């Protein structure tokens, strides 16, 4: 589990609208909320 | 008519989630918004 | 085709509540999203 790939919902040029974008983070960078869900 | 106990529906995290917390405010601190509804 | 009058809503006194409001903007101040849609 050196690197984890996943995405999140983030704001766009229009504040009301939102987009889904993928990013890569190291395993130790994030922590598990609990399955398959994490936060910084 | 001096102390008012109640809770306000506010969110800290989990954007699509709502959780209440109870706090006590003085009567003059909060003004009526309209019955049983107040505002800072 | 020089000044556009139109409606929208944004923040208000209370975060939860909403209010529809109207304002007049110049044609070159805003740009279309595409029909009958614009943004600053």
């Amino acid at each position: 589990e050196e690197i984890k790939n996943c995405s999140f919902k983030a704001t766009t040029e229009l504040r009301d609208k939102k987009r889904r974008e993928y990013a890569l983070f190291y395993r130790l960078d994030i922590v598990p909320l609990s399955n398959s869900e994490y936060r910084l | 008519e001096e102390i008012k106990n109640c809770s306000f529906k506010a969110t800290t995290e989990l954007r699509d989630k709502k959780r209440r917390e109870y706090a006590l405010f003085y009567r003059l601190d909060i003004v009526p918004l309209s019955n049983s509804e107040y505002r800072l | 085709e020089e000044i556009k009058n139109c409606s929208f809503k944004a923040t208000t006194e209370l975060r939860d509540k909403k209010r529809r409001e109207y304002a007049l903007f110049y044609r070159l101040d805003i740009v279309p999203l595409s029909n009958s849609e614009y943004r600053l």
Epitope: R15, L33, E37 | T11, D16, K17 | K18
Partner: antibody, heavy 129, light 105 residues
Framework: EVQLVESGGNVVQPGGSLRLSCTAS????????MHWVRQAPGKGLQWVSL????????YYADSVKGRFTISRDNSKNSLYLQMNSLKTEDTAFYFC???????????????????????WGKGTTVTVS | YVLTQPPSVSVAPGKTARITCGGN??????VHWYQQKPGQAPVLVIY???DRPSGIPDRFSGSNSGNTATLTISRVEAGDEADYYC???????????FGGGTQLT
Amino acid sequence: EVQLVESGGNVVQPGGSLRLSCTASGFSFDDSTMHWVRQAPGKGLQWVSLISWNGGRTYYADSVKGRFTISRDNSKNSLYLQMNSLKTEDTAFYFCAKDKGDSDYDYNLGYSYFYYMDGWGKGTTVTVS
Amino acid sequence: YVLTQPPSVSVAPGKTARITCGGNNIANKNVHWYQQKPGQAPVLVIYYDDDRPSGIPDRFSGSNSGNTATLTISRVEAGDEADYYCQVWDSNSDHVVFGGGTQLT
């Protein structure tokens, strides 16, 4: 006190089209989002479609995203949901329900829209073939 | 994302009903219960798991914590002989899912 009325249902055939009219009054559509669900006999509720005041947040359910479109207008305050390419397992009573449209705004996170039906209509009818 | 409501429940008059709206990590999502009577459209009875709308019988409360979302009823009466449904909004999966209901005696 609000009322929702729907009409236009009748016998239908697979591969055909039907026009459904759903007028309502008592609450302005300017700040109201309308939902759509169906209630087949012996089964639970199923989400059909969602629509916002003008556009965006018009998300559709996974199983009914094929060629289904929902449109809204402010001139006469009504809604439509035209049935197209009817299957042989999508027959049920379609229900349109009002939504409160509550929201919330944090400078960092942004607008967050909550969804939960408040008012419900009488109900429509569908009969494949 | 799906719910795991019980298939049926039996509560004789004078007892309390413990209807549950099962769901994985449902404590992180709000649950709204509905009454689905036969012959007329459903009416919302609970929203945000604590609030309560107007024009409703009193003593209608619900609890939502852990892995189970439970609805509380008291002095059960034959007028409520219908099916209960719970609604939850999901953004990660990007769809709304309703449970299969639970038959009542």
